[model samples]
Target: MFENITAAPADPILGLADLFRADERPGKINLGIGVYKDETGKTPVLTSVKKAEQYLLENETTKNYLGIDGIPEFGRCTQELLFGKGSALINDKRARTAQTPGGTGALRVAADFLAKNTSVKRVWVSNPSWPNHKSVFNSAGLEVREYAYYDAENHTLDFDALINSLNEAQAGDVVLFHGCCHNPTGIDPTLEQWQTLAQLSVEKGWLPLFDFAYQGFARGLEEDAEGLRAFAAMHKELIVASSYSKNFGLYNERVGACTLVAADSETVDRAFSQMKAAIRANYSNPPAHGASVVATILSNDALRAIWEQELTDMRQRIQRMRQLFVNTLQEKGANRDFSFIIKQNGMFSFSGLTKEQVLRLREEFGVYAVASGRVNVAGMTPDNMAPLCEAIVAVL
Candidate 1:
C-alpha cells in the first residue's frame, strides 16, 4: 500500500517558502508566504502577546481539556471583536462562537458543519481567492464555485462581474466573502459595495459566510470590520470565520473562531449544537494558551491598549511598504503603472507578474513571489526594497 501511493503536489505558497529557505544567497527576499514581517524582515512576537503570556503563566492552573467549543470567555471576546461591543447580536444572543485551531481550522469547521447539517451543497469563493479555499471546501465534500472578484488587466475590483456571477447562486447556497483585506489580490469591496452585496443576499436568499482573517491588518479594527458589520445588520443569519494569527501575532499557536449568527437566541443555540458536534468530531477542543492570551489581553484595559497600538504599528508599516514598492519600481524605470498597489490593503498586493516573470525573478535575483503575481507586501522593507524592485524591473 505504501509503495503504491504517489507523491502529492507541493503547496504553491509553502513550496515557495521551502525554496526560499534552501537558497544559499545572502539576500534572498521571500515575498511568497502570507506571514507578516516587520521592517527588520522578522515576524516578531508582539510585546502585548508576551505580557499576556506572562499573566497566563502566573494565573493558569488547568491541565485539563477545554470543552468542544473551547473557553466561554474566548468565544465571547471573539464575538465582541467581530460585532462591536453592545451589538444587538450579543444583546439578543443571536450569535454563537466556537474556538478553533486557527483561521484555517475555523474555516474547516464551518465547512464541515455546513456540509453535515445544512442543505448548502455549494460554496462560492472569489475567482482569485486564497488557493486553499477550494481545498478546504472540497475536502469537506462540498462543491466549490468561483465568483468574479478582481480584474487582472485593470488591477481593480470587478464589482459588476461579481454581482452578475453571484446572481446565479440559488437560495441556500453559501457565498463566501473576505470580511476585509482580500488575500492574494489585496483589494476588498468598498462599504457601498458591501451594502449592495448584503442587499443582494437578502433578495437572492443565499447564505453569507465571511472569512475574516485580517481584521486590523487593513485599517483600524473597527473600520476594517465595517463591511462585515453591514452584513450583520442586514442579514438575520450569516457565518464568520475569524483568525487571531495575523492581528494578535499568534500564527503558530493557531488561534481562531467560527461564529454563526441567526435570527434569534433559540435558533443560534440549535445551530451551535451542530457546530459543537463538528468540533467534537474534529479537533475535540482548541488549544488553551493562545485563547487564554487573547482573552486576557482583551479583558484587561491596559493590555488591550498595548495590543491595539502594536496592531496599528503593523498596519501602518504595511501601508508604508505598499507606497514604497510602487515608488521604487518607478525609480527603477519599470514601464508599468503599479499605483493600484498602494490603494490595496492588508499584507499582500497582486504585483501583476506573470508565471515566466515570476520564475525569472526567483532564478536571477533570489526574489520569491507567487507565480500568480501575489506578493506579500509585509515582506518588503527599507533594506530589501531596492533589490526586490530591481528584480521586478528586470523581469518586467
Candidate 2:
C-alpha cells in the first residue's frame, strides 16, 4: 500500500555534514550549518549550563512529564528574558506560555493555531529566510509569501523595499520577523527601521509573529530584544515564539516558549486555551529536562552570571570570526573587498556567493554553505581560516 512513497530532499544545512565527512581532504571546513564552534573547532558544552544541569540531576526529583505547556519555571524565565522584567505585558492575563520542543515546536504550534482558528491567511517570510521556514508554515496549511528582504545586489538590508511590500499587507496576514540575529542572512532591521515596521503593523492591523531564535547573540540580551519589546509596548496583541536552542545551546532538548500577548486576562485565557489544545495535539506537552536545565541556570544568580559570561564570550568569538574572515581575504591580496561580511552582525553571513559559486565552493574547496550563500561565520576557527579564505577567493 505504501509502495509509492518517494525519497525526500536533503536537509540544506545538516545534509552538508554527511558530504563534508565523506570528503577525503585533510583539512576541510564546514560553514554550512550555523551552529557555533569554539576556537578549538568544537561546539563545547557551556560551563554554566553544565553546572546548573548538575544541580538538577543531583538535587531534583522526577523524570516525569510537564503536560503541554512544559516547565512553569522556564515560562517565567523566558518572560523575564524576552520582555524586560518590569514589562506591563507580564500583568496581561492573555500573555501565557506553551512549552515547545524547540523553536520549531513553538512555530508549529503557532502555525496550527493561526491557520485553524484566527483570520490568519497569508504568512509573509523574508525573501531569503531560513530554509525551513516556508515548509514549516506550509505544512500547517498557511500560505507563505515573501516580503522584500536580502538585497543581494548590495549585501545589506533593503529597508525601503521591505517596508513598501509590508505596507500593502492586511490585518489577518502574518508578517514573520526575526526578533534578533536574523537567520541565514546576518542582516537585521535597524532600530528606526523596526519602529517603522511596528507602525506599519498598526496601520494595517496585521498579526506580527516574531521568531526569536537569538536573544543575546547580536547586541546584548537587552538590545537584542528591542523589536519585541517595542512591539509589545505599542501593540497590545502579538504572537511571539522564542528558542533556547542557539542562545542557550539547548538544541537537542529544545527548550523554548510560545507567547500570545493579549489585552487582558479574559482574552488571554481564551488564547491560552486554544494554544494549549494545539500543543497538546502536536506533542502532548513540552519536555521537562531542558526546561529544568534552563530554569536552574536562570533562577540561580551565580549560575546565571556564569551563563551570561559564557554567552558573551560566544558572541565575541563570532564577531572575531567575522573580522578574521574579512581581514584574511584582504591579507591574501584578493582584489574583491569582502569586508561586508564583517559589517553583517550575528554568527552567520549571507556570503554573496551565487548558487553556482556555492556549488564550486563545495565541489572544489570542500566548503559548503547554504545555496543562498549563507555561511555560518561561527564555523570558522583560527587554524582553518586560511583554507576557508582561500576557498572564498577561489569561489569569487
The number of the candidate with the highest lDDT is 1
Instruction: Report the lDDT of model 2 for residue 124.
Output: 93
> Over the stretch 1-396, how does candidate 1's per-residue lDDT look in tens digits?
799999999999989988889989888889988888988999999999999999888887877998899889999999988999989899999999999999999999999999999999999999998999999999899999999999877888999899888878999999999988898888998889889989989989989999999998887889999999998998989999999999998999999999999999999999999999998998788999998899989999999999999999999999988899999999999998999998898999988888999999898899999989899999899999999999899878
lDDT of each: 0.91, 0.85
Candidate 2 residue spans exceeding 4 A from truth: none
Error of 2 at 227 (Å): 1.1
lDDT of 2 by residue, 275-309 (tens): 88987787787678788888888898998999999
Quote each prediction's TM-score: 0.98, 0.97
Kindly give the stretch of ten consecutive residues in candidate 1 with the minimal lDDT sum.
Answer: 54-63
Candidate 1 CA-lDDT value: 0.91
